[PDB]
Design an enzyme around this catalytic site. Structure first.
Site, PDB file in Angstrom:
ATOM      1  N   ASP A 236       1.834 -19.504-116.024  1.00 32.59           N
ATOM      2  CA  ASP A 236       2.839 -20.186-116.819  1.00 32.59           C
ATOM      3  C   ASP A 236       4.158 -19.434-116.646  1.00 32.59           C
ATOM      4  O   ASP A 236       4.175 -18.258-116.273  1.00 32.59           O
ATOM      5  CB  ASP A 236       2.430 -20.272-118.288  1.00 32.59           C
ATOM      6  CG  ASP A 236       3.149 -21.393-119.030  1.00 32.59           C
ATOM      7  OD1 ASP A 236       4.025 -22.058-118.425  1.00 32.59           O
ATOM      8  OD2 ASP A 236       2.849 -21.598-120.225  1.00 32.59           O
TER       9      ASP A 236
ATOM     10  N   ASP B 105      -6.191 -25.688-119.620  1.00 33.36           N
ATOM     11  CA  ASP B 105      -6.358 -24.282-119.977  1.00 33.36           C
ATOM     12  C   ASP B 105      -6.293 -24.166-121.487  1.00 33.36           C
ATOM     13  O   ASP B 105      -5.583 -24.932-122.140  1.00 33.36           O
ATOM     14  CB  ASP B 105      -5.234 -23.430-119.392  1.00 33.36           C
ATOM     15  CG  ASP B 105      -3.923 -23.600-120.151  1.00 33.36           C
ATOM     16  OD1 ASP B 105      -3.176 -24.554-119.857  1.00 33.36           O
ATOM     17  OD2 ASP B 105      -3.652 -22.803-121.077  1.00 33.36           O
TER      18      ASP B 105
ATOM     19  N   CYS C 184     -28.006 -24.867-122.182  1.00 34.70           N
ATOM     20  CA  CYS C 184     -27.081 -24.060-121.403  1.00 34.70           C
ATOM     21  C   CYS C 184     -27.782 -23.177-120.383  1.00 34.70           C
ATOM     22  O   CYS C 184     -28.777 -22.533-120.694  1.00 34.70           O
ATOM     23  CB  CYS C 184     -26.249 -23.194-122.344  1.00 34.70           C
ATOM     24  SG  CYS C 184     -25.057 -22.159-121.502  1.00 34.70           S
TER      25      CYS C 184
ATOM     26  N   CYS D 223     -26.420 -20.585-118.796  1.00 38.80           N
ATOM     27  CA  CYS D 223     -25.742 -19.309-118.608  1.00 38.80           C
ATOM     28  C   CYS D 223     -26.667 -18.109-118.795  1.00 38.80           C
ATOM     29  O   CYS D 223     -27.745 -18.219-119.384  1.00 38.80           O
ATOM     30  CB  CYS D 223     -24.494 -19.200-119.495  1.00 38.80           C
ATOM     31  SG  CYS D 223     -24.729 -18.490-121.148  1.00 38.80           S
TER      32      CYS D 223
ATOM     33  N   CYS E  83     -27.685 -17.294-122.457  1.00 43.10           N
ATOM     34  CA  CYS E  83     -28.714 -18.146-123.036  1.00 43.10           C
ATOM     35  C   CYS E  83     -30.078 -17.953-122.384  1.00 43.10           C
ATOM     36  O   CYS E  83     -31.102 -18.295-122.971  1.00 43.10           O
ATOM     37  CB  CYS E  83     -28.270 -19.607-123.013  1.00 43.10           C
ATOM     38  SG  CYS E  83     -26.861 -19.897-124.109  1.00 43.10           S
TER      39      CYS E  83
ATOM     40  N   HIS F  52     -20.782 -17.005-122.599  1.00 44.66           N
ATOM     41  CA  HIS F  52     -21.391 -18.287-122.918  1.00 44.66           C
ATOM     42  C   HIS F  52     -20.350 -19.400-123.086  1.00 44.66           C
ATOM     43  O   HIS F  52     -20.518 -20.492-122.546  1.00 44.66           O
ATOM     44  CB  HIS F  52     -22.254 -18.233-124.177  1.00 44.66           C
ATOM     45  CG  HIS F  52     -22.570 -19.595-124.701  1.00 44.66           C
ATOM     46  ND1 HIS F  52     -23.541 -20.402-124.141  1.00 44.66           N
ATOM     47  CD2 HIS F  52     -21.966 -20.336-125.660  1.00 44.66           C
ATOM     48  CE1 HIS F  52     -23.547 -21.567-124.766  1.00 44.66           C
ATOM     49  NE2 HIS F  52     -22.601 -21.553-125.690  1.00 44.66           N
TER      50      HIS F  52
HETATM   51  N1  CKR Z   1       5.759 -23.693-119.932  1.00 46.23           N
HETATM   52  C1  CKR Z   1       5.103 -24.386-120.843  1.00 46.23           C
HETATM   53  N2  CKR Z   1       3.919 -23.953-121.307  1.00 46.23           N
HETATM   54  C2  CKR Z   1       3.217 -24.651-122.302  1.00 46.23           C
HETATM   55  C3  CKR Z   1       2.074 -24.091-122.868  1.00 46.23           C
HETATM   56  C4  CKR Z   1       1.455 -24.737-123.943  1.00 46.23           C
HETATM   57  N3  CKR Z   1       0.368 -24.352-124.727  1.00 46.23           N
HETATM   58  C5  CKR Z   1       0.253 -25.315-125.623  1.00 46.23           C
HETATM   59  N4  CKR Z   1      -0.646 -25.362-126.612  1.00 46.23           N
HETATM   60  C6  CKR Z   1      -1.528 -24.252-126.939  1.00 46.23           C
HETATM   61  C7  CKR Z   1      -0.786 -23.099-127.584  1.00 46.23           C
HETATM   62  N5  CKR Z   1      -1.641 -21.884-127.786  1.00 46.23           N
HETATM   63  C8  CKR Z   1      -2.614 -22.066-128.904  1.00 46.23           C
HETATM   64  C9  CKR Z   1      -3.436 -20.813-129.076  1.00 46.23           C
HETATM   65  O1  CKR Z   1      -2.609 -19.677-129.324  1.00 46.23           O
HETATM   66  C10 CKR Z   1      -1.731 -19.467-128.226  1.00 46.23           C
HETATM   67  C11 CKR Z   1      -0.823 -20.654-128.013  1.00 46.23           C
HETATM   68  N6  CKR Z   1       1.171 -26.299-125.481  1.00 46.23           N
HETATM   69  C12 CKR Z   1       1.968 -25.946-124.412  1.00 46.23           C
HETATM   70  C13 CKR Z   1       3.094 -26.506-123.840  1.00 46.23           C
HETATM   71  C14 CKR Z   1       3.737 -25.863-122.788  1.00 46.23           C
HETATM   72  C15 CKR Z   1       5.028 -26.339-122.273  1.00 46.23           C
HETATM   73  O2  CKR Z   1       5.560 -27.383-122.641  1.00 46.23           O
HETATM   74  N7  CKR Z   1       5.623 -25.531-121.330  1.00 46.23           N
HETATM   75 ZN    ZN Z   2     -25.062 -20.173-122.683  1.00 48.15          ZN
END
Ligand code: CKR
Ligand code: ZN
Ligand code: CKR
Ligand code: CL
Ligand code: CL
Ligand code: ZN
EC number: 2.4.2.29
Lengths: 367, 367
Positions: B93, B264, B302, B304, B307, B333
């Site tokens: 990212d 992710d 599962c 894994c 398990c 897991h």
């Molecule tokens: N560069 C970029 N990265 C993103 C990453 C994102 N992550 C999420 N949602 C999950 C946020 N997590 C939740 C758990 O704690 C950490 C943050 N929403 C996200 C949106 C973006 C985005 O618009 N741009």
């Molecule tokens: Zn498992």
């Protein structure tokens, strides 16, 4: 099929011995180091990883397991081996060192501590049965250090009475007597006459192995070695000698020179999680800034999986960041290092060059 | 030898697709779940274990790595792959989500945050180069939720300007342009017209893949799905579609139904360490007393390693005791479960029975 218990000495050099203990669940190569698995886990390692480092046996603790998750619970779940997934021998301490370490009310019957829980020779042996321990330790009292001769004597005498009670409790339980081994624990503080009386009492009762208790409690290496010098020869030669709670690599080497066959300590695991890595050139603290860009492995000769793959720089980052993988890698390396030390000790005794190994080891480790 | 980047679709069912991304460091099966390795580690797992669960690619973070241990440092040490011991593709990212999540001064040039550190399209792309990322994300701004149409538009427009700057920075670096891929990130909040303008801008610039940004920020599943319904078809069909930060298993299934190829989230890792285990019958909290003597594995089907070997009762004990092995086992897991979910998704699309799988999955998971 292996016997319940058989100790065989293959080679000797001075007071040092190398050999094997055969038990139903496996063979233990001696001198042996036992990784500590107090909470039914060797911290940060799968059992398969513990085994891969070379460990033949691990240590558990009556005191900790009776509190969490409970001895009866573990028995209901099939025993400690099944519970944690280690199918090889397990030695369990009896709780006697917690008798002075981790409110307590002591009496001739045993020790109550505070919920309230009780330990006695009978209850300790029972808990070790419920866990399914392979090597059961007698319930004793680790005499505080320093101790006056009078107090050391009174403590030792109680421990010897408790050793007889431990023997009888163990023998009265048929399945335990037939499948496990029982070790007695010598006390007597730093006093030769008391150590002799303790050895005599234990040999009269008769055990499968003999621990030197009451050491590694603040006395320092010189004094520990002085006590080992006269104490180990008091124990039966044909049974294993176990030095409880030892120790640093140089402590292990010197103790083997003095006739010790078995060791345990939290140093490689605990200090590993804290950033201390063992190397043949002495310990290093991986948190130190000097390692931030060091591409070398933790140790230059170590054959462990950690040293095959990751750099000091990476492990430095992990430990500084408080990452779990840092604890995992440090611990695997340190336990592997300890096992490699034991292997070098065994090989050098077998080849009649242990004295030279000890000298070479020290010259480099303390350079 | 594999190409720099090639996405091929092998089978379709409605909006759902399954296929492969070929890159120099490996093949990625889609739909794909990427375990999160923010601090140059997938928490509590060796890379070999991450791979054994079925992961083809992992996620890293420009923002976190630039702070610790530093991007220049990682480059000096040979890059992120060598540093952490993962030799397969890594997507990073860009820092754009930290642009609103973890003091900040924002401008058209970029974002400064407080030591002080700067991020801009140019610096973000440079950091990702220094890390040696395989899939580089454009530097964007994740619009906060909720947002007014005016604010969402201004934010999206800035992100599109930053997307062009990201493209140019990436292309100007020959080694990066020749060996890595660049994904653009769609913004526009929950507004169809803004999502369309963003998609048009990104397609005009041209990218190797397209992320749906600005979601999983508190809007809830109904709204997220509503936005995906119109947003995904705006993206080029012949390139991967990546939904950032998603998500729970049902979120993943519904997103695949809507044309998403990549995912992710920290849920399997983070919630694993906190005691939440995923099962085909829904999540369980292993800390619950009901599991204290449960000999069954975490999940009944599962495959894994966890398990295969350990009981709920043992893992319950470990997590209650705060033992590192508890985090290790729960995480392995959960990541394995996520990968098995992705495999079932891929297989069912390939066989033209994904709609039935989604229905069956939900009926059981939410029973
Ligand atoms: N560069 C970029 N990265 C993103 C990453 C994102 N992550 C999420 N949602 C999950 C946020 N997590 C939740 C758990 O704690 C950490 C943050 N929403 C996200 C949106 C973006 C985005 O618009 N741009
Ligand atoms: Zn498992
Ligand atoms: N039953 C029994 N167990 C023993 C265990 C011992 N351990 C030690 N020394 C090491 C103490 N560690 C040092 C690291 O923190 C935990 C305690 N010394 C020990 C002595 C005994 C003993 O005399 N009896
Ligand atoms: Cl420990
Ligand atoms: Cl995480
Ligand atoms: Zn090593």
């Amino acid at each position: 099929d292996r016997p319940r218990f058989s100790f065989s000495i293959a080679a000797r050099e001075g007071k040092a011995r190398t050999g094997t203990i055969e038990m139903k669940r496996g063979v233990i190569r001696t001198p042996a180091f036992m990784p500590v698995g107090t909470a039914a886990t060797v911290k940060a390692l799968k059992p398969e990883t513990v085994r891969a480092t070379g460990a033949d046996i691990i240590l558990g603790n009556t005191y900790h397991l009776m509190l969490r998750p409970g001895a009866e619970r573990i028995a209901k779940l099939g025993g400690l081996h099944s519970f944690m997934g280690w199918d090889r021998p397990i030695l369990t301490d009896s709780g006697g060192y917690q008798v002075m370490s981790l409110l307590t009310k002591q009496s001739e019957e045993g020790v109550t501590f505070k919920s309230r829980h009780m330990l006695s020779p009978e209850r300790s042996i029972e808990i070790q049965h419920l866990l399914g321990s392979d090597i059961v330790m007698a319930f004793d009292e680790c005499t505080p250090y320093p101790a006056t001769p009078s107090r050391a004597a009174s403590s030792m005498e109680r421990s010897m009475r408790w050793a007889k009670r431990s023997r009888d409790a163990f023998d009265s339980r048929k399945e335990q007597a037939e499948n496990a081994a029982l070790f007695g624990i010598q006390q007597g503080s730093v006093f030769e006459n008391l150590r002799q009386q303790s050895a005599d009492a234990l040999a009269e009762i008769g055990f499968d192995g003999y621990a030197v208790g009451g050491l590694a409690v603040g006395e320092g290496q010189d004094e520990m070695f002085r006590v080992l010098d006269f104490s180990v020869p008091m124990l039966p030669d044909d049974k294993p000698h176990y030095l409880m709670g030892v120790g640093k690599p140089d402590d292990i080497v010197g103790a083997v020179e003095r006739g010790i066959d078995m060791f345990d300590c939290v140093l490689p695991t605990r200090s590993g999680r804290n950033g201390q890595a063992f190397t043949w050139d002495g310990p290093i603290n991986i948190r130190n800034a000097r390692f931030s860009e060091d591409l070398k492995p933790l140790d230059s000769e170590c054959h462990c999986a950690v040293c095959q793959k990751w750099s000091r720089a990476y492990i430095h980052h992990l430990i500084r960041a408080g990452e779990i993988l840092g604890a995992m890698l440090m611990t695997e390396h340190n336990i592997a290092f300890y096992q490699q030390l034991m292997q070098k000790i065994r090989d050098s005794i077998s080849e009649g060059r242990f004295s030279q190994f000890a000298q070479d080891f020290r010259a480099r480790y303390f350079a």
